[PDB]
Paper text:
Although the first 3D-structures of Sm assemblies were derived from archaea, the function(s) of Sm-like archaeal proteins (SmAPs) remains unknown. The SmAPs adopt a Sm-fold composed of an N-terminal α-helix and five β-strands. Archaea often possess two SmAP paralogues, SmAP1 and SmAP2, both of which form homo-heptamers, and occasionally rings of different sizes. Several studies revealed that SmAPs from different archaea bind to oligo-U stretches of various lengths.
The crystal structure of Sso-SmAP2 was determined at 2.6 Å resolution. Sso-SmAP2 possesses the classical Sm fold, consisting of an N-terminal helix and five strongly bent strands forming a half-open β-barrel. The heptameric assembly is formed via the outer β-strands, β4 and β5, resulting in a ~12 Å central pore.The overall architecture of the heptameric Sso-SmAP1 and the heptameric Sso-SmAP2 complex is very similar, as the superposition of the two heptameric assemblies yielded a root-mean-square deviation (rmsd) of 1.1 Å for 391 out of 515 superimposed Cα atoms. The major structural differences between both Sso-SmAPs are found in loop L4 and in the N- and C-terminal regions.The extended N-terminus of Sso-SmAP1 forms a protrusion on the L3 face at the proximal site that results in the formation of distinct grooves between the subunits, whereas Sso-SmAP2 displays a smoother surface due to the absence of the N-terminal extension. Interestingly, the corresponding region (Thr40, Asn42, Arg68 and Ser70) of Sso-SmAP2 displays modification(s). Thr40 replaces His40, which is responsible for stacking interactions with the uracil base (magenta). In fact, the methyl group of Thr40 protrudes into the uridine-binding pocket, and thereby most likely interferes with uracil binding. In contrast, the L3 face/proximal site of Sso-SmAP2 is significantly more positively charged due to the presence of Asn7, Lys10 and Arg13. Sso-SmAP2 is predominantly negatively charged, which is effected by residues Asp26, Ser28, Tyr30 and Glu50, whereas the presence of residues Asn29 and Lys30 confers a more positive charge distribution in Sso-SmAP1.
Numbering used by the authors:
A (entry chain D): 4 to 82
B (entry chain C), C (entry chain B), F (entry chain E): 6 to 82
D (entry chain A): 7 to 84
E (entry chain G): 5 to 85
G (entry chain F): 5 to 87
The structure:
Amino acid sequence: KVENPLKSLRTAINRIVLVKLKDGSEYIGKLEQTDGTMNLVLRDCTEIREGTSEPVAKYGRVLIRGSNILFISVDYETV
Amino acid sequence: ENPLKSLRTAINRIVLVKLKDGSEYIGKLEQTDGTMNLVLRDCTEIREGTSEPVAKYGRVLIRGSNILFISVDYETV
Amino acid sequence: ENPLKSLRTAINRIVLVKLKDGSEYIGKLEQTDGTMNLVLRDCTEIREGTSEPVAKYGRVLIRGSNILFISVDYETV
Amino acid sequence: NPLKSLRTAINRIVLVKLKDGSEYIGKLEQTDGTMNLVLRDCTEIREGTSEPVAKYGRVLIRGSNILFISVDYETVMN
Amino acid sequence: VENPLKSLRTAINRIVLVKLKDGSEYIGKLEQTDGTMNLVLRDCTEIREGTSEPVAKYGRVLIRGSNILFISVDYETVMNS
Amino acid sequence: ENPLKSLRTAINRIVLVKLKDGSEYIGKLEQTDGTMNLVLRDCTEIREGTSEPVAKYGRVLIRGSNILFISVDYETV
Amino acid sequence: VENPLKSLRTAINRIVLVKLKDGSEYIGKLEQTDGTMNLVLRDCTEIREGTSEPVAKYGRVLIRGSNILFISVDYETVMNSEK
């Protein structure tokens, strides 16, 4: 079957991803929805700071605007 | 399962709207457009943690173009 | 529903406009537009947080793409 | 509608504020749907005053960078 | 009357001034423009507060119209004062 | 003759991506498309001149509209 | 005489300067171009303000036309002041 960047976004549904917006902020959540424009819907969204033991704020269920995203960590693994 | 009807399901509830400014706002969502244009009843700007209320704007119309994200169920307390 | 119809209901009233640079402007709304191009009267710039006019501009055509939000029902005084 | 309010001020002085917050005045000649303007005798005046900074002559201002345009400057004369 | 792009198109073979989004100004001799306000200038040099300096020569440059604040189409008349 | 068809010659290779943040990231390019969206494996953030990584993000989807330039083969050897 | 984007294609194999919106300048030898001003460069070297002194080597880069301020076509001869 096919493989394209945007399909790989659609395959990350129901798993834990990191989204980095353009302001430099990073939010971890359980990916639930996507679209072509990269509009995300996440569950248990938590802002984090790199370094640090992850969370610094919780936002619950969040609709993210694809226009403002820099990248998406498709399968975020803490090791 | 569209990312947008999740938004329009959140109408009549209290939402958090963050903008590129890092500016966060909280208010009862009334109306919603496909380009994520927003109207909020009782929209008070809140700093992050802080104190919360910073400025009370009443009913605001928010351009969708300038939004980072929207916490659709921001009765997260 | 439709968020921009909420803009045609503020005409001939005072509104507050937050622009992208963060500067705020009060004035009386006259005409509107699809691109949220606004025309205000007695428009005075006020500084972030306060109600103090630091500059008055009179009748002002505002470009819509540079607007953060519009406080539609700025009675709240 | 707004963009015909703009044409009211043809051959009259308007004030234009760009995204970087720099303000410019000059006599409006020509406009279009994206608010691309043409001004004569363009100057930088400094905010609050009408004391020039830089003269620029006839200028074409790209519309997307415009914060606002005060079409009825020159009545701020009063 | 009117069509802002036209005043740009009659400015060919003239000395113009371009203020870009980075906030810097340049002068040069205009040579090619299009509908997207893309500019081709000769003898381009960065520009200042008053008269006009030669801070940095960039020669023959193509200027992407999407990042231009404005263009002064008769700048020679200006620095002829 | 096409700038983008030089990008797809870099798949499975290590490239450097500088976002508009100025922030730069190295990683094995896996997937691309016409919008210059990229998928990197072992995406790590770097500071030019230094050896230590700023952050590890693993397999990353990079949105194409926020990229400055792609070093479509970082031969640092 | 002709059309801006096309004058960019007469600059293939030349040393050109590219300034991005952030303000950083890069020097390299132009390979491939398209309508949206997307570029491919060899010898891509970031140079410091106005000078011709290298600060970072990037080799072959695909540059996004969206983020360009300008392109100094044939930049080679424009190295009078130094080298």
